[PDB]
């Protein structure tokens, strides 16, 4: 019965202002002592508390981000807004809004603290990326199999999918016919501001001579499709 | 204020009983919550006010403590419980979350297979050089990868990526990518990836000499 939902831009450029909106149902910010907070999660990392606003317009901010943060509410629209000025790439994260209960009240009297000590319902989250780059399809390079990539009768090989923006990219092997032993790694954001990943597969070394291996790379944001055949290393 | 969760990671099996700890640098009375977060989803509240069981939350979850020491307990682990857990204190501003506790599917130790890939001639022509080191199908998740270029430890110019725990064999894989300019790449001979892992009696080095053919 309580639901929250974040909205905003998925991409903002450095120095710009990010405005996020929380839209909620099943509670009112007129409810005594109710809070709406914001929490973020950088990719691969932990939760970080950002801010909170209450029914009475009391608000608090993270000390480390507090010059850049403003929190507001419109109790009649069931919305809370968070403004974060001068964004930069560190600010890339999934942003959640969340409800905090007010205390237990008896015929309006607060009789118990308990229930306030959590954030009880969260929104789904909105991913926001902060970058100054523009759409760019990747280059696909081969990761060639060789002695230095052999273990018993197994060899590894792959494709390096480099310098693209934005996410995402998909990769298959041999047009879908090869699925076993395949590891497609999550992309990393390089300091250049462009993403990169690699996709690997382990196969039998015996098969390197005969079987053909091709990675199929799709970056839909740039309309780039590449099939890259991967051959055994020459200087091995 | 610091909230410290331990362990950071733990292995476990369905039916197991597990205990996760959260300590606060100073007393936060009972103002402590625990959440479970599955990959791709928001955190979900398990326990509020240190020990109170959130409505709708299975009875296997419980919490204890007051002041500075708090523990979450799952009496009998279910599949849905392989997930990451966080504590949060709400006694002082700013509210603060712990660093998280990853809980994965235990299996027998397995050393990774290590492969090193020189940069392709194709990439080199473009002006850059990526050296890739691959650690395949290992467990547990903790691994250490070290790059050396002609014995020079490389710090700050590599990046790692790790897969999610495999649904079949319960292993992880990890890539470490060393990036250099072409010019820099061609000034040096020996490229070496050193891997430290529990399943390896001692560190494994995989290397090559560039241009050797």
């Amino acid at each position: 019965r309580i639901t929250l939902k974040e909205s905003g831009p998925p991409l903002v450029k450095p120095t710009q202002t990010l405005t996020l909106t929380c839209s909620f149902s099943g509670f009112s910010l007129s409810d005594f002592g109710v809070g709406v907070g914001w929490i973020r999660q950088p990719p691969g990392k932990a939760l970080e508390w950002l801010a909170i606003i209450y029914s009475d317009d009391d608000k608090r901010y993270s000390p480390s981000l507090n010059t850049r943060l403003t929190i507001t509410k419109d109790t009649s629209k069931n919305q809370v807004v968070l403004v974060m000025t001068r964004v930069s790439p560190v600010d890339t994260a999934t942003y959640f809004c969340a409800h905090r209960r007010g205390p237990t009240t008896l015929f309006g009297v607060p009789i118990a603290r308990g229930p306030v000590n959590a954030m009880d319902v969260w929104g789904q989250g909105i991913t926001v990326t902060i970058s100054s780059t523009s759409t760019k399809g990747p280059s696909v390079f081969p990761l060639a199999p060789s002695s230095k990539s052999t273990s018993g009768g197994t060899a590894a090989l792959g494709c390096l999918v480099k310098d693209y923006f934005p996410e995402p990219v998909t990769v298959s092997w041999n047009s879908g016919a090869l699925t076993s032993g395949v590891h497609t790694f999550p992309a990393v954001l390089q300091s250049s501001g462009l993403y990169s990943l690699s996709s690997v597969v382990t196969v039998p070394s015996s098969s390197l001579g005969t079987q053909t291996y091709i990675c199929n790379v799709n970056h839909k944001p740039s309309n780039t499709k590449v099939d890259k055949r991967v051959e055994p290393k020459s200087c091995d | 204020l610091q909230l410290t969760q331990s362990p950071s990671s733990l292995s476990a099996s369905v039916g197991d009983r597990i205990t996760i700890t959260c300590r606060a640098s100073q007393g936060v009375t009972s103002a402590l919550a625990w959440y479970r977060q599955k990959p791709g989803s928001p955190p979900q509240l398990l326990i509020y006010d240190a020990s109170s069981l959130e409505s709708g939350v299975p009875s296997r979850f419980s919490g204890s403590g007051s002041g500075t020491e708090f523990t979450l307990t799952i009496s009998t682990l279910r599949p849905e419980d392989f997930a990451t857990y966080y504590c949060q204190q709400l006694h002082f501003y700013p509210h603060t979350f712990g660093g998280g506790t990853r809980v994965d599917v235990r299996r027998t130790v397995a050393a990774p297979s290590v492969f090193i890939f020189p940069p392709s001639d194709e990439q080199l022509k473009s002006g850059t050089a990526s050296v890739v080191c691959l650690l395949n199908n290992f467990y547990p998740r903790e691994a250490k990868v070290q790059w050396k270029v002609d014995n020079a430890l490389q710090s700050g110019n590599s990046q790692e990526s790790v897969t999610e725990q495999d649904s079949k064999d319960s292993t992880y894989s990890l890539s470490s990518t060393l990036t250099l300019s072409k010019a820099d790449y061609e000034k040096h001979k020996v490229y070496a990836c050193e891997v430290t892992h529990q399943g390896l009696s001692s560190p494994v080095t995989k290397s090559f000499n560039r241009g050797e053919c």
Partner: peptide
């Protein structure tokens, strides 16, 4: 540590 107390920190 000169931390501020939560809104409800002083409620029973």
């Amino acid at each position: 540590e000169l931390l501020e107390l939560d809104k409800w920190a002083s409620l029973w």
